């Protein structure tokens, strides 16, 4: 009963946090200065912390900083630029492989659920359209995407890669969570860059982005990691995203939602607008997830953002 999750403060942490307590786990929770009010103060909030949320300071980049917190732990959750190499693509590996080396020595350790990203998956070359669907078996050349300077892309790519070698080698059990844009409820008066993206729209914004990504509720994602890791028969990557949508999309979706709000009506550029594409559910749906659609996310978020203090609409 008693599991590990790492970066709590995350935004995806924060709601895995909450529903572990709520389903009655004691939660070794790491964040890196639990002595910080300011930044733990959402996470005490949270029913049942207060008995049974045990915050431990923790640096990712650190080596063996996650030794003894994760020791006593059925499962572990992890879920925590100029030069691309050492300012993202090495803290990104390091810290993956600090968190596993901790876990690979813990006895009472039975699985890992590695939060990862649909980028680890969906970046292979081949075209992605309306009739294309994305699913788990496809994973992201990174040499291809580092040759258009898609870092982020391949730092994930990466550090999955790195995850999946280490396991298989370390005789540990580990399940990936791979979520697109993660949007829903905010615990606290912080944004994320997704909760952000929706936030532009809404505040005065003269145009919207020629772009289209996948988009998953923030209570989706956190329920898929909770699935994941008590589901036995749970194995491989999850793909976490409950549709892909252009932003035009997203906005028709606000014009419903909000009548009366002033919303941009011109795209970016005048280019065709970035194709859409489907991405398989079937993985995370076998455990019994059931998939909050678009526009219940997008009420959410504007609702949090208001009762935030972001948006004044």
């Given at each position: 009963n008693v599991v590990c999750v790492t970066g709590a403060s995350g935004y995806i942490a924060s709601w895995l946090v909450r529903l572990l307590l709520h389903r009655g786990y004691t939660v070794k929770a790491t964040v890196?200065?639990?002595?910080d009010p300011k930044k733990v103060d959402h996470l005490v909030k949270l029913d049942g912390a207060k008995e049974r949320l045990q915050l431990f300071k923790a640096n990712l980049l650190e080596e063996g900083a996650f030794d003894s917190v994760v020791q006593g732990c059925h499962g572990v959750f992890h879920t925590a630029v100029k030069d691309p190499q050492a300012e993202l693509i090495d803290p990104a590996l390091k810290g993956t492989l600090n968190v596993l080396n901790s876990c690979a020595k813990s006895p009472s350790l039975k699985r890992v659920v590695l939060t990862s990203s649909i980028a680890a998956v969906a970046y292979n070359g081949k075209p992605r359209t309306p009739d294309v669907v994305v699913d788990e078996t496809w994973f992201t050349d990174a040499d291809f995407c580092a040759k258009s300077n898609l870092w982020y892309v391949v730092s994930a790519t990466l550090a999955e890669e790195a995850a999946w070698k280490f396991v298989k080698e370390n005789n540990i059990d580990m399940v990936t969570i791979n979520p697109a844009m993660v949007i829903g409820p905010?615990?606290?008066?912080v944004l994320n860059t997704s909760a952000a993206a929706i936030l532009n729209l809404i505040n005065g914004a003269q145009t919207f982005p020629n772009a289209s990504f996948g988009w998953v509720n923030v209570k989706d994602v956190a329920n898929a990691h909770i699935l994941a890791y008590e589901n036995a028969s749970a194995s491989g990557r999850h793909c976490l995203v409950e549709r892909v949508a252009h932003y035009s999309e997203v906005v028709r979706i606000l014009r419903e939602l909000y009548p009366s709000l002033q919303l941009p009506e011109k795209c970016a550029d005048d280019k065709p607008y970035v194709p859409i594409y489907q991405v398989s559910k079937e993985k995370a749906k076998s455990l019994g997830l059931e998939y909050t659609p678009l526009e219940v996310s997008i009420k959410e978020t504007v609702e949090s953002l208001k009762e935030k203090k972001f948006a004044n609409l």
């Open positions: 890196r200065d639990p002595n905010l615990l606290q008066p």
